[PDB]
Design an enzyme around this catalytic site. Structure first.
Site, PDB file in Angstrom:
ATOM      1  N   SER A  29       0.548   6.323  13.019  1.00 38.14           N
ATOM      2  CA  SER A  29      -0.401   5.850  12.012  1.00 38.14           C
ATOM      3  C   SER A  29      -1.752   6.448  12.306  1.00 38.14           C
ATOM      4  O   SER A  29      -2.373   7.041  11.416  1.00 38.14           O
ATOM      5  CB  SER A  29      -0.487   4.359  11.924  1.00 38.14           C
ATOM      6  OG  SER A  29       0.810   3.762  11.934  1.00 38.14           O
ATOM      7  N   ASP A  35       0.817   8.155   2.914  1.00 40.75           N
ATOM      8  CA  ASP A  35       1.325   9.481   3.195  1.00 40.75           C
ATOM      9  C   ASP A  35       1.322   9.750   4.691  1.00 40.75           C
ATOM     10  O   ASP A  35       0.812   8.988   5.499  1.00 40.75           O
ATOM     11  CB  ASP A  35       0.480  10.504   2.471  1.00 40.75           C
ATOM     12  CG  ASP A  35       0.902  10.610   1.025  1.00 40.75           C
ATOM     13  OD1 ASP A  35       1.977  10.096   0.718  1.00 40.75           O
ATOM     14  OD2 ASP A  35       0.152  11.207   0.217  1.00 40.75           O
ATOM     15  N   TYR A  55       0.845  -1.185   0.000  1.00 41.24           N
ATOM     16  CA  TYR A  55       0.000   0.000   0.000  1.00 41.24           C
ATOM     17  C   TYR A  55       0.876   1.229   0.000  1.00 41.24           C
ATOM     18  O   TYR A  55       2.004   1.226   0.477  1.00 41.24           O
ATOM     19  CB  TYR A  55      -0.865   0.018   1.242  1.00 41.24           C
ATOM     20  CG  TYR A  55      -0.127  -0.095   2.535  1.00 41.24           C
ATOM     21  CD1 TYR A  55       0.286  -1.313   3.052  1.00 41.24           C
ATOM     22  CD2 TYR A  55       0.091   1.048   3.285  1.00 41.24           C
ATOM     23  CE1 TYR A  55       0.945  -1.374   4.283  1.00 41.24           C
ATOM     24  CE2 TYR A  55       0.746   0.996   4.498  1.00 41.24           C
ATOM     25  CZ  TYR A  55       1.186  -0.207   5.000  1.00 41.24           C
ATOM     26  OH  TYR A  55       1.851  -0.134   6.196  1.00 41.24           O
TER      27      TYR A  55
END
Lengths: 235, 235, 235, 235, 235
Positions: free
Chosen positions: E209, E134, E131
């Protein structure tokens, strides 16, 4: 995060039907294609019987898709095998890709209540509804940035709403974090399609959905019995 | 959330016309296709006459679609049946998918008022406008995170704006939570297309729309009488 | 919201040219197609002459579209008729859909300055630029949640910037609330394409654009005279 | 906003190659198509020699595009002419649209350093990288809602980062406000592709990029010399 | 920002298989196409053996792609060469573009642990997951607007989560700032696909995250051995 228990991989393969092409196809050829496809599902049915997996076929209302094959298999390589065998059928020439979702049935493995939920024989209900969902990670509303206990309480009210619509809507949640584009796939099964509206609407007024729910597309469909498959493709 | 009353399922099926292909099609073949399609609608008309459903066909201006079939049927399986029968017509070979919306006419059921609103015979108005809408669940503006009473008051001003444009714009709201990608489908019917602009603009200055309205695509079109269908496909 | 005055419906139909297919088409067939299309525009020109509508054709730079037909007609049913007649031309077989925008020239109707602006004969300027725009309804910046007077003052500075670029850029604003996906279509016409850059950039530094402007795609093109149409399609 | 100086119009036309079709095309036909295309570029080369414009052809890595023609011409009508001549070549039958960007070289016109920067002969560097960019107009971070002096200071640090990567990365900024969907097109040219990574990453840690940068797609490619064009299309 | 060390360029080329077309293709032609493709990979294998690059082929589950070729090469021009050679194979006629990602393996160059990580021979694990990601530059959560030390601490907890799933999931991070649309490509390799779910989910509960992660599409697949390639394309 280590607390979630993991059952079957689940592929929702939604396809659209290329009716125009399908009609062009000679009758005997169309007939063979349905035979071919049915024998495929017959394979899947054998798998289901051996408790080695499960499936559902639903025709989807609307234009986002025409038909949904939902396959639960123990391994992801098995999933891939099924998708590939589907795609190499005659019929699949006319079943254009529409949307797909891979995910893992998620909720100690030995306990029957867990076992049933982890390795679920999909309900043969009249209707199905599927949508992928995320938990918002956005500003104030960032579920991941939430305390375990906050999240617990959030999920407490969610369970309450779900439980109201139990015995009406069967709910298969599949986690897809690191398998797909959202975090969960929610698949609902009811004999009444309106119960989906009822459940998902009520749920939106739960802080968890209201604040943390980010949803994907919703797909609703109607069970396609295999006896009904010949009919459904008849042109 | 349990307070909403549920009538007919509603499918807005928007299609685009493949004029290039349609022209290629021989004249007698085109003629048959229109006959075929008309006989389909004749079926739908019979359903409408029996008060067992309703439909509308509108040609849509712009390129998002060419034609909108709006079907209200009691069951979602009926909807699916209609879509499938459409899609298996010759004409539908040239009616490419563009956008679709499934939803349920939403607002005790026995009352003659509310009966009408739940099982609405769609108005044969010159123009239609459709858009799906959501209520924002975004930060400060999170409708679901709102008090029932707040929401009530919000919807009070909304009703006021609506009511101004009653007797001009007929408004069919369909809920699609758990049926489709947005929460409501709003379908407006007026003999004057500008009244749509008037209504939807005024409504945006209501706190509810201003703050909570998230909208989808708008489609406006013109009624396609069935006597006008032959003409409209004439090439 | 009731203060806005409403003139002509406006369709911006942007198409892309399927040059590959167009080239395949025999020369005499291509020639006929251009004749056919030109005779169509000749119809439109007659409408413009009778002050019963207006049009513009512009070839668009870039790949978002190739050609823009901008049609202003009194009724939306007329718009639809024009789109449909276009789409049923040979040439339109090669003019693939790209983007479209429906909208209504918006700004008592009797007054000439209003009359001109409401029923505008589109300027035959060298270049055009089109973009749809919204007013932000987002958090702090929610134009609809603004006081009438705030909005008035906001629009005051906007008028100032516009007025600087008057006599250079002609500006046709069309409202499309309840006709299309954004709220306004802005179409600019200048003999100098750079004036578009100048105007739209300066405007962005106005609180109204800076804070409230949400924009769609920009399309800029060059006028396609009808004498230039044969040439432009020559392969 | 009146302070920006305006040079050449710039079209980045990115196309993808339809290799499958291209292969189907007979050898002598393919050969002619390359000849045809090369003679086109030969035209462009003449324009570049006369200092009346500039171009670059780059093959793009990845699937977003295959080839990028970047054309700088004095007028936008010239741009359109070039695009149209490209599109009417045989080869362009196989060069499907992928993405395009129109913009104007922006930075008194008489001064040589300005002149060079406004009418730039594009560097024949091994690699190119293109991305469109906006300045965020979002909440707290709204560049347009910023003071001229704030913006000045913001751009001061930006210039510092740029200047570090000068003599490595040549940077052509094109403004596209009112020409295209973003505000700036940034085209970087380096003999080392990694310098693009280096420059754009360092730049992101500048308040201006960190806070105000909204970016489009990035495209990187490798110069396609014209003597390499025959080879590159050889099948 | 100058601290990151740069190894191989990495192209993830995801394609979908046009099974319908592929089946149409005669048997001996299909056979040749597989031979042709295999000989290509044989080239790549030689490159891998010379430590001059690396590759992996994985069949992807779901409809986002069918097959993923992941190529690591020293130069980006080499990448482009490989993509182009792929695209000019017979087989590639049936391998439609799906998604692609270019990026550079990023972390002194001479140090073996660096050398291994910078020039990584891709693991021949049963499954892969890819994946792009950003770091959020959004409001309060703007990673770039963060202090170096804040970021350091953020990345400290990230390393902890990663390290738990080391010896299970191999993780190749590629930076793509100024090469592609996101900032990093994360490619995970495990013999167990569920470990991807485990790792990526646990990671989401890390502030980095939870707060800063913006993710692209996830693709998971199964290694396609080259001995398995003939089989996989057998129709």
């Amino acid at each position: 995060a280590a607390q979630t228990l993991d059952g079957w991989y689940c592929l929702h393969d939604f396809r659209t039907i290329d009716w125009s092409a399908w009609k062009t196809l000679p009758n005997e050829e169309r007939e063979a294609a349905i035979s071919e496809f049915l024998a495929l599902v017959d394979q899947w049915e054998t798998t289901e019987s051996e408790k080695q997996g499960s499936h559902a076929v639903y025709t989807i209302v609307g234009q986002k898709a025409d038909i949904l094959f939902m396959i639960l298999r123990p391994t992801l390589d098995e999933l891939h095998e099924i998708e590939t065998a589907l795609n190499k059928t005659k019929l699949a020439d006319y079943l254009l890709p529409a949307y797909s979702y891979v995910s893992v049935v998620e909720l100690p493995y030995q306990i029957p209540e867990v076992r049933r939920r982890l390795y679920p024989i999909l309900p043969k209900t009249n209707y199905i509804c599927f949508y992928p969902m995320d938990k918002r990670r956005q500003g104030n509303d960032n579920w991941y940035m939430l305390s375990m206990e906050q999240r617990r309480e959030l999920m407490r009210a969610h369970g309450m709403t779900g439980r109201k619509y139990a015995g009406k809507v069967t709910q298969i949640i599949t986690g897809s974090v690191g398998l797909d584009d959202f975090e969960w796939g929610v698949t609902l099964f009811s004999d009444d399609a309106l119960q989906f509206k009822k459940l998902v609407y009520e749920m939106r007024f739960d802080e968890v959905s209201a604040r943390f729910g980010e949803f994907g597309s919703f797909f609703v469909g109607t069970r396609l019995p295999m006896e009904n498959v010949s009919s459904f493709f008849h042109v």
